[PDB]
Design an enzyme around this catalytic site. Structure first.
Site, short mmCIF file in Angstrom:
data_model
loop_
_atom_site.label_atom_id
_atom_site.label_comp_id
_atom_site.label_asym_id
_atom_site.label_seq_id
_atom_site.Cartn_x
_atom_site.Cartn_y
_atom_site.Cartn_z
N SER B 63 40.87 -14.06 -15.44
CA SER B 63 40.56 -15.16 -14.55
C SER B 63 41.86 -15.76 -14.05
CB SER B 63 39.68 -16.23 -15.22
OG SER B 63 40.36 -16.89 -16.28
N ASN B 75 38.38 -3.01 -5.76
CA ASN B 75 37.14 -2.32 -6.09
C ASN B 75 36.23 -3.20 -6.98
OD1 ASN B 75 38.85 -2.04 -8.30
ND2 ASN B 75 38.19 0.03 -8.84
N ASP B 81 35.40 6.73 -15.51
CA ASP B 81 34.43 7.73 -15.85
C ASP B 81 34.85 8.37 -17.15
OD1 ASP B 81 32.84 7.83 -13.21
OD2 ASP B 81 34.93 8.13 -12.52
N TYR B 84 37.41 11.05 -17.16
CA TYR B 84 38.78 10.67 -16.85
C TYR B 84 39.51 10.51 -18.18
CZ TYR B 84 42.59 8.37 -14.02
OH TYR B 84 43.78 8.03 -13.37
N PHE B 92 44.74 2.72 -13.56
CA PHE B 92 45.42 1.92 -12.58
C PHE B 92 44.59 0.71 -12.19
CE2 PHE B 92 43.13 5.22 -10.09
CZ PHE B 92 42.39 4.45 -9.20
O1 LIG Z 1 34.93 -16.75 -13.88
C1 LIG Z 1 35.20 -17.28 -14.98
C2 LIG Z 1 35.93 -16.56 -15.92
C3 LIG Z 1 36.24 -17.15 -17.14
N1 LIG Z 1 35.79 -18.37 -17.46
C4 LIG Z 1 36.13 -18.98 -18.77
C5 LIG Z 1 35.33 -18.32 -19.89
C6 LIG Z 1 36.29 -17.38 -20.56
O2 LIG Z 1 35.96 -17.17 -21.96
C7 LIG Z 1 37.65 -18.05 -20.32
C8 LIG Z 1 38.77 -17.02 -20.22
O3 LIG Z 1 38.52 -16.09 -19.16
O4 LIG Z 1 37.52 -18.79 -19.08
C9 LIG Z 1 35.01 -19.07 -16.49
O5 LIG Z 1 34.55 -20.20 -16.73
N2 LIG Z 1 34.73 -18.51 -15.30
O1 LIG Z 2 40.06 0.51 -11.20
C1 LIG Z 2 40.10 1.73 -11.45
C2 LIG Z 2 39.10 2.59 -11.01
C3 LIG Z 2 39.20 3.94 -11.31
N1 LIG Z 2 40.25 4.45 -11.98
C4 LIG Z 2 40.30 5.90 -12.30
C5 LIG Z 2 39.21 6.19 -13.32
C6 LIG Z 2 38.05 6.82 -12.58
O2 LIG Z 2 37.31 7.79 -13.37
C7 LIG Z 2 38.73 7.43 -11.36
C8 LIG Z 2 37.93 7.35 -10.06
O3 LIG Z 2 37.21 6.12 -9.86
O4 LIG Z 2 39.99 6.76 -11.19
C9 LIG Z 2 41.22 3.54 -12.44
O5 LIG Z 2 42.21 3.89 -13.10
N2 LIG Z 2 41.10 2.24 -12.17
MG LIG Z 3 34.02 8.29 -7.68
#
Ligand SMILES: O=c1ccn([C@H]2C[C@H](O)[C@@H](CO)O2)c(=O)[nH]1
Ligand SMILES: O=c1ccn([C@H]2C[C@H](O)[C@@H](CO)O2)c(=O)[nH]1
Ligand SMILES: [Mg+2]
Ligand SMILES: O=c1ccn([C@H]2C[C@H](O)[C@@H](CO)O2)c(=O)[nH]1
Ligand SMILES: [Cl-]
Ligand SMILES: [Mg+2]
Lengths: 143, 130, 140
Positions: B63, B75, B81, B84, B92
């Protein structure tokens, strides 16, 4: 052995498929779409489904959607409930373009899977929780 | 208890850890990265993994990633997957910078968990829904 | 059925089930300028059932209504975020000048069983084939 019934918008839609190395299933643009930089468009995906009872679908971009098409998904991840199963309940991908872009009919722009909906719950209001605060928003630092 | 096998890019990577109050596990930048405003960069995470049989991983930002580093994840939620799992299949984080930013090696920029894949499903085409 | 305990920030918060995602609301009026960021407080703190986390995403209409995206995409509420001042927030980046009104529904959540205890075993060599990634399957 679980079944998803899928109805296509028309005969020209490219039927979707499961690939061995894809844990989620790619969905496809139902038509050509041109979007300008800093502008929005609900991209039709040309499918309506009846999901198994008690399930929902989640739709997210593919890791390559930005590189290929220069869009992000404005609702982050889309939730399709089992009840969105009518004959005209087609799916849409809400795209915001970070650069000028052209998406071609049939292009695989996002992916979906199904999973069980959350269990039945009830929300019970209380005046006091009586727990220590965790903190949030980067309370654990970065290093 | 399930095992996740993790292979690091090199010995300079900070080994990852589960913290008591973190339901997801933090992943870290494998090198220093500079990203200019309105540009994209695949931030290397320096880890390659074999997940237990039948499982996928999901990756989302922390957050605090936006406040600290000015980037969003293009994304939304990454899906690693199960297949992978090769020795060159390094994970990444696809970052789009909304302002000029610097990320440092070892910084925790996103978090992950594992989940059972969707089972085999049959896609049955119909002319009308009921 | 499982119980979720909910505490509201104060008496003015609008009060909130069969499996659907649950809508959450802005705890106060929020003004965000174009290309700027604001936490939207949601005015709720909760104790989820034992072993559960929560996930927060925007509502389908949030972008149309408010011109905001959620900077962390899907928020993860940790089970331990159950303190009396552990109030939930929605991290918002405005793509246009926007006004959000107190009580407006802006995101949605569900709970889910957290990942169980896992052992992280460092290895020197995985020994599997490479799948490849980042759009290795193309687009057509
Ligand atoms: O979108 C978000 C993400 C996190 N949190 C709070 C709950 C979580 O345990 C803490 C650390 O991410 O912050 C939120 O309130 N909203
Ligand atoms: O945020 C992402 C999304 C995908 N991948 C890798 C794993 C996945 O199997 C492949 C294609 O989506 O690339 C990542 O490292 N990070
Ligand atoms: Mg794919
Ligand atoms: O990204 C999304 C999210 C939802 N829906 C469907 C299901 C939902 O019930 C309806 C209204 O948002 O639209 C989509 O087509 N795409
Ligand atoms: Cl979810
Ligand atoms: Mg954290």
């Amino acid at each position: 052995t679980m079944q998803i019934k899928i109805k296509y918008l028309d005969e020209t839609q490219t039927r979707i498929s499961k690939i061995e190395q894809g844990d989620w299933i790619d969905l496809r643009a139902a038509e050509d779409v041109t979007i300008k930089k800093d502008e929005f468009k609900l991209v039709p995906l040309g499918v309506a489904m009846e999901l198994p009872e008690g399930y929902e679908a989640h739709v997210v971009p593919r890791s390559s959607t930005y590189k290929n098409f220069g869009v992000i998904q404005t609702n982050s991840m889309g939730v399709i409930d089992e009840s969105y199963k009518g004959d005209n309940d087609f799916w849409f991908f809400p795209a915001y373009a970070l650069r000028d872009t052209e998406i071609k009919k049939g292009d695989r722009i996002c992916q979906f899977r199904i999973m069980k909906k959350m269990p039945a719950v009830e929300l019970v209001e209380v005046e006091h929780l009586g727990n220590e605060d965790r903190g949030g928003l980067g309370s654990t630092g970065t290093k």
